[PDB]
RNA sequence: UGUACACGUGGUAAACACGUGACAGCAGCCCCGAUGGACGGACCGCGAGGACCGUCAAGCCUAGCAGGUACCUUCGGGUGGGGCCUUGCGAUACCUGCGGGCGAACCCUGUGGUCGGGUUUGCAGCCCGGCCACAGCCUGUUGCAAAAAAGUCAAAUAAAGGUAGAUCAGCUGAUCCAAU
């Protein structure tokens, strides 16, 4: 339709105008990085966390000089791959594509709209505003012509450092960004590829299920069986580094041609890869267009799908009667994301498998990193009943001798935090990630959230792929907690449960790998025999798997409490019990029943400044230095180390500073006035005729309720009061309510003042909250029931209480005579 | 191994016997991640802990990790310190490398040899990093010196006689709780 052509021309004109507008020191680059990371974090949190952990904070340090000269020859080099050979064709031998795009699959495609703009300039809306029918028409026209507009094919490449302190242009990685319309068009084609012919059962990477689930179990079962019955077992892991950087376009197209795919799709892929370009954007400087001759583009939707055909060919090239006989099951190869794990019993069989892999990789231009691959070989011998590890190098990939490793510490088949090949463990990659988070231009709450939700769930898998102990997990926990205490400036003697206890109970909710690794093992290997894999079911009924499952159950039972409502173990209850029973975490024990008293720790974090959040955390856990809290174990002196500095001649605890001290009386008045004004304004928003500090010269004495209000014939008294948490908050709420709801004459006075005759119309109420921002459940319910008060206006009263509490403490500290 | 216990056998029964065994149990709970070391002296409530003073040489700790060597095992395997107890079958000796923090060196370049790399069909060349060596009584010139002076009083020595803002510093660079 001409409407689609018109809107496409309009969008192209907008992109061209944006390009024309764009074209026409340490401090400044740090500020630019801060602005970029803040915009990215506020836009897409997961990608921002991935970028900050990956190390994309220091940017580059070499400019376009010595970076375009270093990388342009690398990106411009056509592979001299001979292409597929008839033997590989027969090894692989051991239709509905390119159909017109409908409107159902466009909306059905789960395309993440929370991305970054491409080089043309379509950021997030100009592609969202297009209706599905117009996008379908444009996609159909593109397939009919076989070409994408040349503005869309352009992509921008930016270099992210590998080493935190690069010393050359060679230690950067060229991550590419392409246009959103192209990505959306190619996502449909990738989904069609999956729906057409799925990969083999051995290939459990880019599949429609969790990939590294049963692979670790199968590897560990193989290792345990070989170690048990004294069999011969060779396990070679070879990683596909530059899987994305040396594949030849012509050989890839030829392989896709003989797989049986339609001629049109192969021609489209050939046109896409032959007509390719790239702009090297370093420090927001332009570069001349760069040709690319080595295929599989970084970040393209089709790339991890195109490489599945190559990996399927590689797997089909393997010899038949090779592998390990794990319980009458022949396990040949385990394909991770970008790794091949080959198992064999005979040295000749392992050499044969490696040789086949190498020959296929050589005939299609792939390079295999012998610096990131290893072989672990267990050779038994008779008359000794022991297992011996090979130390000298025996296998080789086309001449280069593969290194022989004795242990299994290459559990890096988890994804990012890529492999070191027996040089360093999985740690010192977590430490590097912690440093990346620590040095980035972020806020302390942002660091907490990134570590909570993106760092831990991404390395925790690797600690399962082997035999592990409790001490390693405890040491990892210690290191992570030290990093968190560095970020938040917390002292050493803070409750260990405070870091890990859930947000609802009051706590930073940093997961503890010591407790979530046994839970992961229990949840993952329990359903091992229910999986529809055949090798995994065989690995389920083994000896090492069962022993590890028993160890995991024991660790979970010792690091959990049984949930009454479901009769299941729960680490959250364990941490809650440990924290609420602590000294500093005791006063938070009431925060479980009021989930709105802890909405600032995670939910309403972006609304709080960094120093405000840090001081809120300091006051919440009572990390404030006082003569009582700061003198733990050093109370052998006189009363001068305990007496209040204001001359109160009493024990100077934080409660004394913050709740009863003549020095901080004005601060208490100010905090009370702030809370009263906030609630009064909130109630006036609800059409409540609010009076402030009413004058009731009652006969009994001098009563000063906080606020009084009325609405269409029903009145209310609200009293604001901030108290301690050592006693029950509900008893304080009731004791503050009774002195007004049972005085007898105050009710009549308020009824007369408000303008309502019946004294039962006006009901007394209170707004009770502790100085740690812990609500009283009765007070919260009464505020939500008597007066119409929504959740957003109730979640700020903890903020006001915490801010006023720290205000009082720093007023006490700032003047000392 | 050894305890406590279900079935079956034959037997009139038993404080009789044997065999097969729930993944059969029973192999208790809680707390602790610290810091250079050998040898002579003054400190402390000489008490559980913490300073200080001398030399010395490079190593010193480690309930972190990996692998190998022996012993007890029981087949599973097993080696830190302290407390509460209570019944509630367990397991130790060193050496090597890696990781951490304490040292110490380390700074005159370039040849060599290794280990990480990356470039590359290519371990050939190549450029980055970490180690090991090596072809070197006071008148003055030169090495320990925070900038023109403090004084090493016998040295080697002669017919000597600025930022968006703030801060620490030494206009620049880091550090923020500050930073779109």
PDB file of C-alpha atoms (C1' of nucleotides) in Angstrom, chain A residues 26-27 31 34-35 38 42 70 74 77 228 242 294 362 367 371-372 389 399 403 406-407 409 428 439 441-443 469 471-472 474-475 478 482 489 547 550 558 578 610-611, chain B residues 23 30-34 63-69 75-77 98-100 116-123 128-129 162-166 173-180:
ATOM      1  CA  UNK A  26      39.380  12.028  32.099  1.00  0.00           C
ATOM      2  CA  UNK A  27      36.774  14.188  33.846  1.00  0.00           C
ATOM      3  CA  UNK A  31      30.805  12.580  33.056  1.00  0.00           C
ATOM      4  CA  UNK A  34      27.850   8.639  33.878  1.00  0.00           C
ATOM      5  CA  UNK A  35      25.141  10.260  31.762  1.00  0.00           C
ATOM      6  CA  UNK A  38      22.222   6.553  33.967  1.00  0.00           C
ATOM      7  CA  UNK A  42      16.632   4.150  33.757  1.00  0.00           C
ATOM      8  CA  UNK A  70      44.703  -1.987  14.393  1.00  0.00           C
ATOM      9  CA  UNK A  74      41.362  -7.463  11.159  1.00  0.00           C
ATOM     10  CA  UNK A  77      40.126 -10.094   5.776  1.00  0.00           C
ATOM     11  CA  UNK A 228      34.623 -45.500  40.479  1.00  0.00           C
ATOM     12  CA  UNK A 242      35.978 -16.305  17.144  1.00  0.00           C
ATOM     13  CA  UNK A 294      34.329 -12.829   8.157  1.00  0.00           C
ATOM     14  CA  UNK A 362      39.247 -25.847   8.842  1.00  0.00           C
ATOM     15  CA  UNK A 367      39.358 -21.021  14.304  1.00  0.00           C
ATOM     16  CA  UNK A 371      44.721 -21.279  24.482  1.00  0.00           C
ATOM     17  CA  UNK A 372      41.180 -21.685  25.880  1.00  0.00           C
ATOM     18  CA  UNK A 389      46.070 -38.077  35.568  1.00  0.00           C
ATOM     19  CA  UNK A 399      49.673 -29.547  15.301  1.00  0.00           C
ATOM     20  CA  UNK A 403      47.147 -28.514  27.353  1.00  0.00           C
ATOM     21  CA  UNK A 406      44.206 -32.540  35.978  1.00  0.00           C
ATOM     22  CA  UNK A 407      41.223 -30.985  37.778  1.00  0.00           C
ATOM     23  CA  UNK A 409      38.019 -26.031  37.206  1.00  0.00           C
ATOM     24  CA  UNK A 428      39.055 -13.796  40.172  1.00  0.00           C
ATOM     25  CA  UNK A 439      34.371   1.505  39.808  1.00  0.00           C
ATOM     26  CA  UNK A 441      29.520   5.677  37.762  1.00  0.00           C
ATOM     27  CA  UNK A 442      26.567   4.322  39.738  1.00  0.00           C
ATOM     28  CA  UNK A 443      24.654   4.945  42.978  1.00  0.00           C
ATOM     29  CA  UNK A 469      32.621 -27.844  49.418  1.00  0.00           C
ATOM     30  CA  UNK A 471      34.146 -23.567  52.600  1.00  0.00           C
ATOM     31  CA  UNK A 472      34.445 -22.282  49.033  1.00  0.00           C
ATOM     32  CA  UNK A 474      31.326 -19.443  52.498  1.00  0.00           C
ATOM     33  CA  UNK A 475      34.453 -17.661  51.255  1.00  0.00           C
ATOM     34  CA  UNK A 478      32.524 -13.385  52.699  1.00  0.00           C
ATOM     35  CA  UNK A 482      32.928  -7.283  52.032  1.00  0.00           C
ATOM     36  CA  UNK A 489      30.284   2.040  54.208  1.00  0.00           C
ATOM     37  CA  UNK A 547      25.524 -38.503  46.949  1.00  0.00           C
ATOM     38  CA  UNK A 550      22.028 -36.070  49.680  1.00  0.00           C
ATOM     39  CA  UNK A 558      20.689 -27.023  57.852  1.00  0.00           C
ATOM     40  CA  UNK A 578      18.480 -15.190  62.425  1.00  0.00           C
ATOM     41  CA  UNK A 610      22.724   8.299  47.259  1.00  0.00           C
ATOM     42  CA  UNK A 611      23.688   9.833  50.588  1.00  0.00           C
TER      43      UNK A 611
ATOM     44  C1'   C B  23      19.219 -44.348  49.646  1.00  0.00           C
ATOM     45  C1'   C B  30      26.291 -23.047  68.167  1.00  0.00           C
ATOM     46  C1'   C B  31      30.274 -19.269  67.272  1.00  0.00           C
ATOM     47  C1'   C B  32      34.859 -17.585  64.850  1.00  0.00           C
ATOM     48  C1'   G B  33      38.257 -15.061  58.209  1.00  0.00           C
ATOM     49  C1'   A B  34      42.366 -13.017  61.718  1.00  0.00           C
ATOM     50  C1'   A B  63      38.306 -23.778  58.882  1.00  0.00           C
ATOM     51  C1'   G B  64      40.350 -20.842  50.441  1.00  0.00           C
ATOM     52  C1'   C B  65      41.492 -24.037  45.863  1.00  0.00           C
ATOM     53  C1'   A B  66      43.915 -28.077  42.880  1.00  0.00           C
ATOM     54  C1'   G B  67      47.031 -32.315  42.377  1.00  0.00           C
ATOM     55  C1'   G B  68      50.216 -35.860  43.964  1.00  0.00           C
ATOM     56  C1'   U B  69      52.901 -39.133  48.569  1.00  0.00           C
ATOM     57  C1'   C B  75      32.919 -50.093  51.523  1.00  0.00           C
ATOM     58  C1'   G B  76      31.452 -43.411  51.863  1.00  0.00           C
ATOM     59  C1'   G B  77      35.882 -41.337  52.960  1.00  0.00           C
ATOM     60  C1'   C B  98      47.654 -21.262  42.564  1.00  0.00           C
ATOM     61  C1'   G B  99      44.444 -17.266  45.345  1.00  0.00           C
ATOM     62  C1'   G B 100      44.362 -13.537  49.531  1.00  0.00           C
ATOM     63  C1'   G B 116      50.139 -15.353  29.935  1.00  0.00           C
ATOM     64  C1'   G B 117      48.585 -13.347  25.846  1.00  0.00           C
ATOM     65  C1'   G B 118      46.786 -11.526  21.339  1.00  0.00           C
ATOM     66  C1'   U B 119      48.073 -10.930  15.076  1.00  0.00           C
ATOM     67  C1'   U B 120      48.272 -14.996  11.617  1.00  0.00           C
ATOM     68  C1'   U B 121      46.991 -21.379   7.426  1.00  0.00           C
ATOM     69  C1'   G B 122      51.040 -21.192  10.757  1.00  0.00           C
ATOM     70  C1'   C B 123      53.772 -22.434  18.177  1.00  0.00           C
ATOM     71  C1'   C B 128      51.893  -6.229  24.579  1.00  0.00           C
ATOM     72  C1'   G B 129      52.608  -7.946  30.163  1.00  0.00           C
ATOM     73  C1'   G B 162      42.088  24.480  36.980  1.00  0.00           C
ATOM     74  C1'   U B 163      36.867  21.001  37.269  1.00  0.00           C
ATOM     75  C1'   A B 164      29.192  21.315  37.104  1.00  0.00           C
ATOM     76  C1'   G B 165      30.813  21.087  43.094  1.00  0.00           C
ATOM     77  C1'   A B 166      34.034  19.832  47.056  1.00  0.00           C
ATOM     78  C1'   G B 173      45.850  13.612  37.671  1.00  0.00           C
ATOM     79  C1'   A B 174      42.561  11.000  40.999  1.00  0.00           C
ATOM     80  C1'   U B 175      38.552  10.369  44.954  1.00  0.00           C
ATOM     81  C1'   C B 176      33.632  11.125  46.248  1.00  0.00           C
ATOM     82  C1'   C B 177      27.810  10.490  49.567  1.00  0.00           C
ATOM     83  C1'   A B 178      28.950  14.574  44.088  1.00  0.00           C
ATOM     84  C1'   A B 179      27.939  13.490  39.380  1.00  0.00           C
ATOM     85  C1'   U B 180      22.058  12.459  32.857  1.00  0.00           C
TER      86        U B 180
END
